[PDB]
């Protein structure tokens, strides 16, 4: 007509937030500097401002960031279609299409209508839309109502079309809003188990086995997801304190003497480096410094070549025989000094191969023929008893330091480390001091041969489990000490580690001082290697994989300690118990949670309000509306809101409303009384406060000026100012006291009333060939013979469960044979409907009178459905009548044998 | 009469087929009635017909193009509109790392119900995996995670004695790995020099890729300017 | 006798390019330098080797540069502190120096599409890759989802490898998810110890039509305001059109974390023509707060919600204006860019910062020097005043006191300030001095500044003072160094600087001068100088309309955007709606947080000056070392102090 029609409008949909997420490129040629680019975009759907902000990276330039790019996009006239973020499907909701004419001079008469869709009922259909004329003034708005009912869940479609009267104009806005299933969703955690293989699992595999969550008032047909979470639990190893560096300043020391002496000046210095750069100390002791310890070093090297003799071996003096002890104690410090400073390979493999060749005896002992002056430097070798252990333990230590360095040039290096360990292991059970034992047990747990009952002995020799001493020097027992604590460290024995460190610590031993370089070198190599073996944190390596009945391939994660923190996440819609089990060394946390959505009572609606609406014949049609609303909090309810929409064609009274604005703790807009009688049909009451302790009422006159065949009921909402979210919405209308629109319900399904009710017929009764016609119908999916196994009733429906006896002709659904389909039949249409138990029957129908989906798939009795008698074989043969049964079987032959032609 | 017979506008029929039958002689003031074929639509307000004038038939309204609804976006995906009217086209592309399922060209046509469809379906952009990351003799790089992606690095380490050849880290593109690196056992011979110190890097123990310079005292023997390093194989490739 | 020095950075950064800059003094001749980086205490391996010969024609001044390797072979953890060893040798003259380790390598910045998200949809984010230089670089990046909990959901190891310094990412957001504040961080694998982050919430929303700007007619509020706060409420549609409604107002205080609500605050007043007034009482304000005295409210903040109802009821729009402080001056006085330490008897420069309450910057307002006649002066365009004060030459403290003079403010309402400076400490009482000086004017690239050198020393010993040289400290290391020229008798110089955008946001200048002391040993006299950059993009980034034709687009109408930026230059974009914005506005990327991430990161640590020449160098991140010995202290700590 004058109106443009509504397919022709292609409604506005594309509403993204965000768009134009597009990497570009100046490649164009530059005038300047700077390069054009001229982009073409299509402008997205929506009436706004976009903030359009560009990032540019240069490998010149580096990173620039724009100042933001506006534009605005507008219309004269359009519709703000205003959707909630989701509804609560089968609960009645109303909806405001806002229609916008921002003409100065110019009133729009326009048609606006809320377009079908099966998935909601509303006041339109299939059969006949939902229009509304309606006029809205220059530089003015419209509010439009739309009551509707979401049938199913998911993302649904809502389209609102608008044109405009003798005006080339429309404007059409199609959105989806989320549809949520009834009640509340819920966390259910449903197992909580900690991950230790080794503590809480046999043969280092642990297994739990997690059952379904317990889903009992939970709603039909909703989804639910399990979740299994996955963690790792870090757990730091505590070690024990480094040395101070302050306490190393007096191991720094200017080396002087005499072969033996040089050496004493040279251990300190050697050992406190070897610490501090172990230790990492060098800040709190002076980075500068390090300089200096090295050239002290290098100064006691260079002097101790003075001491060398030709045989490669060293004294005190050049005219002195050589000691053994001497010898093997230089390679030993040569050794530890080797990365501080350059030494020479000849010099240091040189005196190695002196002790082998010279000093070893066939059983593999070090024997010394020309003992140090300075006795004091042996340490525990000092004692008399069991010189031949101690000294080829000595010897072979030394040796071992310089097995890395002297393996190419020293042939029978290996052999005497060898032979030296078998003397050790041969003897070793017979050692009656803990020195000994100490040192001795060292050397053997540096070959790896000190096991069995010679590890037994080591350990047992311990007192208190936390030193090795013996009658004497002190500082004797804190070198063997030190010497057991390297031990346990070459056999990584960390359990009985801190009770030993921590005695050497308490000793409180820090070296210098006449006859101590031997527990000074001890005790700072033994302290720096347990700083450099100690571990910071325990080790987290594991395994785990959870085998679910539904996937075939199970799903392994590997925890580790770098993303212990890491949360891995497994999800099943399914609620199917299944097992887990973690491998490998460490701890763990599984957590086995299930969301879904659970039936309330009480109901969730109406929580902090309670709204009771009426609408009642007044004593040119007006009705009376009144409204009671009470707070449900502790105390009275700050400022309030009552927005209230209009039934179809009525408008409040002036007067009435103008009293009402007048009245005292309330208030309505200067706008909304100023507002002519039409075309609103939207009104806000802005209450002071709502008590909490009774109903707050009121009541005013409503007008029907304009009369439609379809009411559509109106609504009140209230809520307070602060919270949108905690609301109450009441419906009313006057041939519905609910306000409800007429739908059924069967379980949680619900569809909108249609006048689709199974006809009855007939009295003059039917031929073959209409059965034959109507049933051979493109348009019927089924054809079926039954018999009514058990009639049940339903709120809304009357039900019958029919075993399929015989599939004439099949539909989508498949019956197969002797399978259970339940037919329904709405109460109204009871009338028509003459079913009985135990009796066979004749149906067909539409595939359109499907609803829902298997399991619980149900079959409406509507007008097309065809439902007859069948009479039993019995029954059959006799009159009254043989023709009916005769028919029956040529309609089966027919449609079995040829069914339908194209 | 004074007129003629006229032959359909371009996308128009006649809104009665009968007309062209009916060969009516047409008189001055005489209308003829047009529908849009389909696919179109009237530019204005009203009916649109011709009027026939003494010179000629006179055209009152027009038909154009009906439109399609705008495209939506696809997620890693760029969107190439060439309009939106009736049998434009809109060609797809994914961004790099993503491959394309379905059809990469789309037009705006007619559908059943007569209306304004996009077909076909848009297309999805789905992320190209490299998986499988390669494992490596006496090594372990870790990784624990599946499918990796363009971009996804996974860095090797090997364990214990072994020396590490190569780059650690592998990188994932076009769903193929780079070459990872192999972890070799490698030792290294002391080195020896005739009246040579030694400067720098002494270690006791030399695996690999190992530096060292040397100082010596003069009348030092070879040329020139020393310095070594440690290559696999054990083998020392430069002027000892 | 001659002597040789070098100076570093006093912080060294892997896989970044580092100078170091060697001198020689009283030197003849060529003189061959070889420079060596090791790793300390361990000099396993050459981490660098370089040479070069300093040329008498040079002005015997050198420099070497390196990049550490990025192999980072020297093991991180338990996180710091990494050292190396930097040795420069001479003609068989050695001097080593042993510096600090920052792993950090780089900078990374997090771009989301949005500040907001509903759960089910997706989060676009784009980590642009940059080194300190601030220019595009490949590298392996590690990145982390992290819930509200503090937890991480999802770990990814990504290279940015041919992405031209940006990578694209994307994370879906489960339906079912909880809500709260998000975070994406990201480091450069390299650098674990550096995290960049950014934060986007989760939540369940529809976007308005609308938005509500509430601003007080203050950006403060005077604690003796008979008037009491006034706010005015502004209501317009996204799309530019005014609204109509009823607005609902309400006052709060805020004292730290807490909130206390002022119930009585609460007013409902109409909004017409897009507008609407409201005003917090003085009583009723007083009135909500347990203690009588008012003064007690200064030092804590106002906060006014606003809640905008469509006449239609079909649109809500929630806004909020908070941290109003509550003052006794609309005036801040800052002493955060005037060094710490004077020279006796040399003026002492004093950079005072004027700032609004809400920590902006002041224009035009009057500011002297308590205890001293006149020296009145003006505040910048950037809020910046500059003070001289003669000193009296002692090693007494100095105590400056610095106050507003505002015409129309009563004396109590003025802004005040106090700071102490030390005296810098001669070695030995030579009672020698450099001084440096600068214009302080708005400082902007393609730009000259002039830096003035100015010495007090005793004439006996000054004739030997030839030259000065100079060292450009900018985004943590050296980016140009030289030589200042003195003639004998000359106590000022000028030097003539030209400013780029590598000066950019902020540099600093230490000078020094070195002569034989009357002690006969060596002496080293340094002062260093701090001065602000107006900050911008190195080159250029432009968006706007290419249709031009100054009318308003329709929705899915084809428009034509044009960009302007430099040749090669990869540009992302985005399109959000302003609705978003109106229901979150943080996080947004710009310029001036990319220039306070580099701010944060810098190696200097005070504005100028020490407490000796070591103090000097050190407080502008630097390491001297020289043969006679005279060295600044190893360096403690990466973080500046404070
Ligand atoms: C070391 O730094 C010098 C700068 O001057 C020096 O800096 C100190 C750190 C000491 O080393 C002192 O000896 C001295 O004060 C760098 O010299 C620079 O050279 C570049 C070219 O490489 C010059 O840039 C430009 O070059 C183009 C041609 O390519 C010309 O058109 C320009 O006019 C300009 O000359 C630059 O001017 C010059 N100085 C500056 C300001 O940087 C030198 O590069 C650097 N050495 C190393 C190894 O990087
Ligand atoms: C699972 O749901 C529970 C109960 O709803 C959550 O517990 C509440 O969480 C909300 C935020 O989502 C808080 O505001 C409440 O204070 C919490 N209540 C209690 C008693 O804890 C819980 O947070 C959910 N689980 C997870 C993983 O967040
Ligand atoms: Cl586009
Ligand atoms: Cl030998
Ligand atoms: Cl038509
Ligand atoms: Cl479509
Ligand atoms: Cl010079
Ligand atoms: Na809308
Ligand atoms: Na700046």
Not at chain 1, 59 to 72: H, R
Not at chain 2, 57 to 76: A, E, V, Y
Not at chain 3, 467 to 495: C, F, H, S, W
């Amino acid at each position: 007509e004058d109106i443009i029609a509504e397919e022709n409008i292609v409604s506005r949909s594309e509403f993204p937030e965000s768009w134009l997420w597009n990497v570009e490129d100046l490649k164009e040629p530059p005038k300047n500097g700077i390069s054009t680019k001229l982009m073409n975009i299509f402008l997205k759907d929506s009436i706004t401002t976009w903030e359009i902000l560009a990032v540019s990276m240069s490998d010149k330039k580096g990173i620039c960031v724009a100042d933001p790019f506006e534009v605005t996009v507008m219309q004269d006239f359009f519709i703000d279609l205003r959707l909630p973020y989701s509804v609560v499907r089968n609960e009645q909701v109303e909806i405001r299409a806002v229609l916008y004419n921002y003409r100065q001079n110019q009133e729009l008469k326009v048609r606006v209508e809320l377009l079908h869709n099966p998935a909601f009922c509303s006041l339109a259909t299939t059969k006949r839309r939902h229009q509304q004329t309606v006029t809205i003034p220059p530089k003015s708005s419209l509010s439009v109502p739309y009551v509707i009912v979401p049938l199913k869940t998911g993302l649904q479609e809502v389209e609102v079309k608008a044109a405009v009267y003798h005006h080339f104009i429309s404007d059409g806005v199609r959105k989806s809003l989320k549809v949520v299933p009834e009640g509340i969703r819920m966390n259910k955690t449903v197992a909580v188990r900690t991950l230790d293989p080794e503590r809480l699992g046999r043969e280092g595999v642990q297994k739990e086995d997690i059952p379904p969550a317990d889903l009992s008032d939970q709603v039909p047909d909703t989804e639910s997801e399990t979740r299994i979470l996955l963690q790792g639990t870090p757990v730091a190893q505590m070690t024990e304190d480094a040395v101070d560096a302050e306490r190393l300043k007096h191991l720094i020391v200017t080396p002087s003497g005499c072969g033996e002496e040089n050496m004493i000046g040279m251990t300190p210095t050697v050992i406190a480096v070897h610490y501090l750069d172990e230790t990492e100390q060098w800040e709190k002791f002076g980075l500068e410094k390090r300089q200096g310890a090295l050239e002290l070093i290098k100064k006691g090297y260079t002097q101790q070549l003075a001491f060398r003799q030709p045989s490669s071996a060293f004294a005190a003096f050049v005219k002195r025989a050589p000691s053994t002890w001497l010898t093997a104690y230089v390679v030993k410090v040569f050794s530890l000094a080797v990365n501080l400073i350059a030494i020479d390979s000849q010099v240091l493999c040189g005196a190695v191969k002196w002790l082998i060749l010279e000093k070893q005896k066939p059983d593999g002992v070090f024997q010394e023929d020309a003992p140090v002056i300075h006795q004091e430097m042996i340490g525990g070798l000092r004692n008399n008893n069991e010189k031949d252990m101690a000294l080829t333990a000595f010897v072979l230590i030394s040796l071992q330091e310089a097995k890395d360095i002297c393996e190419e040039q020293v042939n029978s290096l290996p052999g005497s480390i060898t032979k030296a360990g078998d003397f050790l292991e041969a003897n070793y059970m017979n050692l009656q001091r803990s020195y000994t034992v100490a040192i001795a047990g060292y050397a053997l747990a540096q070959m790896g041969r000190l096991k069995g009952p010679l590890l037994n002995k080591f350990l047992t020799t311990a007192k208190d489990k936390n030193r090795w001493e013996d009658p004497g020097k002190q500082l004797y027992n804190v070198e063997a000490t030190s010497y057991a604590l390297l031990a346990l460290l070459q056999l990584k024995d960390f359990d009985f580690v801190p009770p030993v460190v921590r005695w050497l610590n308490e000793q409180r031993y820090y070296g210098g001082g006449y006859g101590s370089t031997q527990a000074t070198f001890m005790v700072f190599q033994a302290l720096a290697q347990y700083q450099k073996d100690a571990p910071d944190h325990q080790e987290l390596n594991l395994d785990v994989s959870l085998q679910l009945p539904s996937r075939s391939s199970k799903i392994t994660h590997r925890i580790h300690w770098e993303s212990a923190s890491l949360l891995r996440s497994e999800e099943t819609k399914e609620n199917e118990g299944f097992t887990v089990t973690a491998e490998g060394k460490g701890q763990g946390t599984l957590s086995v949670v299930t969301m879904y959505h659970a039936k309330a009572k009480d109901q969730l609606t109406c929580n902090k309000f309670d709204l009771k609406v009426t609408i009642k014949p007044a004593p040119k049609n007006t009705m009376i509306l009144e409204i009671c609303t009470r707070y449900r909090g502790d105390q009275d309810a700050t400022m309030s809101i009552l927005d209230i929409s209009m039934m179809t064609g009525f408008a409040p009274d002036t007067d009435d409303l103008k009293q009402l604005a007048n009245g005292v703790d309330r208030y309505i807009s200067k706008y909304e009384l100023d507002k002519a009688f039409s075309d609103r049909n939207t009104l806000i009451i802005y209450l002071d406060k709502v008590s909490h302790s009774e109903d707050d009422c009121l009541a005013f006159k409503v007008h029907q000026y304009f009369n439609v065949e379809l009411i559509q009921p109106g609504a009140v909402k209230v809520y307070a100012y602060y919270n949108l979210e905690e609301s109450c919405t009441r419906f009313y209308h006057p041939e519905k006291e609910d306000g409800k629109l007429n739908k059924l319900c069967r379980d949680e399904l619900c569809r909108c009333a249609e006048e689709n009710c199974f006809i009855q017929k007939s009295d003059d009764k039917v031929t073959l060939e209409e059965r034959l016609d109507k049933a051979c119908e493109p348009g019927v999916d089924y054809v079926y013979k039954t018999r009514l196994v058990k009639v049940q009733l339903s709120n809304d429906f009357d039900e019958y469960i029919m075993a399929i006896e015989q599939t004439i002709k099949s539909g989508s659904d498949e019956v197969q044979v002797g399978q259970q389909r339940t037919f329904i039949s709405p109460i109204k249409c009871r009338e028509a409907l003459k079913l009985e138990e135990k009796k066979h029957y004749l149906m067909w129908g539409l595939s359109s009178d499907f609803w829902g989906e298997k399991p619980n798939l149900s079959y409406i009795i509507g007008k097309d459905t065809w439902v007859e008698h069948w009479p039993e074989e019995d029954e059959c043969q006799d009159e009254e009548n043989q023709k009916q049964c005769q028919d029956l079987g040529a309609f089966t032959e027919s449609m079995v044998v040829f069914g339908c032609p194209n | 009469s004074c007129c003629t017979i006229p032959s359909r506008p371009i996308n128009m029929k006649f809104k009665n087929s009968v007309e062209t039958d009916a060969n009516a002689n047409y008189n001055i003031g005489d209308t003829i009635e047009y529908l849009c074929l389909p696919g179109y639509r009237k530019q204005k307000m009203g009916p649109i017909y011709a009027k026939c004038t003494g010179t000629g038939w006179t055209l009152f309204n027009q038909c154009i193009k009906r439109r399609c609804p705008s495209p939506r976006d696809i997620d890693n995906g760029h969107l190439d509109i060439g309009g939106v009217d009736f049998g434009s086209s809109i060609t797809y592309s994914c961004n790099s790392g993503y491959y394309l399922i379905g059809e990469y060209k789309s037009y705006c046509k007619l559908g059943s119900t007569g209306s304004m469809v996009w077909n076909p379906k848009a297309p999805i952009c789905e992320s190209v995996k490299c998986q499988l990351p390669p494992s490596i003799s006496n090594g372990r790089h870790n990784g624990y995670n599946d499918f990796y992606t363009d971009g996804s690095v996974v860095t090797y380490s090997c364990n214990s004695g072994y020396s590490l050849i190569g780059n650690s880290g592998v990188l994932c593109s076009g769903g193929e790995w780079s070459n990872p690196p192999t972890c070799q056992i490698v030792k290294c011979p002391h080195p020896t020099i005739l009246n040579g110190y030694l400067s720098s890097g002494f270690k006791r123990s030399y695996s690999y890729n190992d530096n060292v310079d040397f100082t010596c005292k003069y009348g030092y023997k070879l040329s020139g300017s020393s310095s070594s390093t440690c290559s696999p194989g054990n083998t020392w490739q430069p002027e000892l | 006798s001659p002597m040789y020095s070098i100076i570093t950075p006093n912080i060294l950064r892997l896989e970044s390019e580092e100078t170091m800059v060697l001198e020689a003094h009283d030197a003849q001749g060529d003189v061959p330098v070889t420079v060596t980086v090791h790793d300390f205490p361990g000099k396993k391996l050459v981490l660098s080797s370089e040479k070069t010969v300093l040329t008498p024609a040079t002005n015997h001044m050198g420099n070497v540069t390196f990049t550490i390797p990025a192999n980072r072979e020297f093991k991180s953890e338990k996180g710091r502190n990494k050292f190396v060893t930097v040795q420069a040798t001479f003609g068989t003259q050695v001097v080593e120096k042993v510096v600090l380790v920052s792993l950090q390598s780089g900078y990374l910045f997090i771009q989301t599409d949005k500040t907001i998200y509903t759960p089910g949809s997706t989060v676009l984010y784009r980590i642009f890759t940059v080194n300190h230089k601030l220019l595009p670089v490949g590298r392996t990046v590690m990145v982390n989802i992290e819930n509200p909990e503090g937890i991480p959901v999802k770990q990814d190891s990504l290279s940015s490898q041919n992405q031209l310094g940006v990578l694209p990412l994307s994370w879906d957001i489960p339906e079912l998810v909880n809500m709260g504040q998000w975070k994406i961080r990201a480091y450069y694998e390299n650098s674990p110890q550096q995290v960049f982050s950014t934060e986007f919430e989760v939540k369940e929303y529809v976007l308005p039509s609308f938005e509500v700007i509430v601003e007080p007619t203050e950006k403060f509020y005077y604690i003796y305001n008979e008037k009491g706060l006034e706010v005015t409420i502004t209501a317009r549609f996204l799309y530019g059109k005014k609204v109509e409604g009823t607005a609902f107002v309400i006052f709060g205080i805020q004292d730290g974390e807490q909130r206390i609500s002022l119930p009585e605050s609460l007013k409902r007043i109409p909004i017409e023509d897009g507008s609407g007034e409201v005003v917090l009482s003085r009583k009723v304000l007083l009135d909500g707060v347990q203690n009588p005295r008012a003064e007690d409210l200064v030092g804590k903040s106002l906060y006014v919600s606003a809640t905008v109802i469509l006449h239609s009821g079909s649109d809500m729009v929630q806004a909020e204006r908070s941290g109003i402080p509550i003052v006794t001056s609309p005036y801040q006085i800052h002493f955060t860019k005037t060094p710490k330490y004077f020279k006796p008897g040399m003026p002492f420069d004093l950079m005072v910062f004027v700032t609004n309450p809400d920590g902006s910057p002041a224009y035009r307002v009057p500011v002297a020097v308590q205890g001293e006649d006149t020296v009145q002066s003006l505040t910048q365009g950037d809020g910046v005043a500059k003070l001289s004060i003669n000193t009296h030459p002692s090693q007494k403290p100095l105590s400056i006191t610095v106050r507003t003079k505002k015409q129309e403010l009563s004396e109590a309402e003025q802004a005040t300030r106090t700071m102490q400076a030390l005296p810098y400490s001669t070695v030995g009482n030579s009672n020698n001095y450099l001084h440096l000086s600068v214009l302080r004017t708005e400082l902007r690239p393609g730009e000259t500044l002039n830096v003035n050198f100015l010495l007090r020393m005793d004439r006996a010993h000054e004739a030997k003072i030839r030259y000065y040289t100079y060292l450009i400290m900018n985004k943590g290391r050296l980016l140009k160094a030289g030589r200042q020229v003195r003639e004998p008798g000359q106590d000022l110089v000028v030097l003539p600087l030209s400013i780029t955008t590598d000066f950019i946001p902020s540099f600093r200048l230490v000078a020094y001068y070195t002569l034989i002391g009357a002690s006969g040993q060596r002496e080293v006299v340094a002062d260093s100088v701090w001065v602000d950059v107006k900050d911008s993009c190195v080159g250029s980034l432009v968006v706007k309309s290419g249709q031009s034709e100054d009318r308003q687009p329709v929705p899915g109408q084809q428009m034509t955007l044009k960009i302007e930026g430099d040749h090669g230059a990869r540009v992302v974009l985005v399109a959000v709606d302003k609705g978003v914005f109106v229901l979150n506005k943080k996080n947004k990327l710009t310029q001036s947080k990319i220039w306070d991430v580099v701010e944060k990161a810098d190696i200097g640590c005070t504005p100028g000056s020490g407490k000796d020449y070591a103090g000097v160098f050190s407080d502008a991140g630097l390491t001297f070392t020289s043969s006679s010995g005279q060295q600044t202290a190893q360096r403690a700590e990466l973080q500046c102090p404070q």
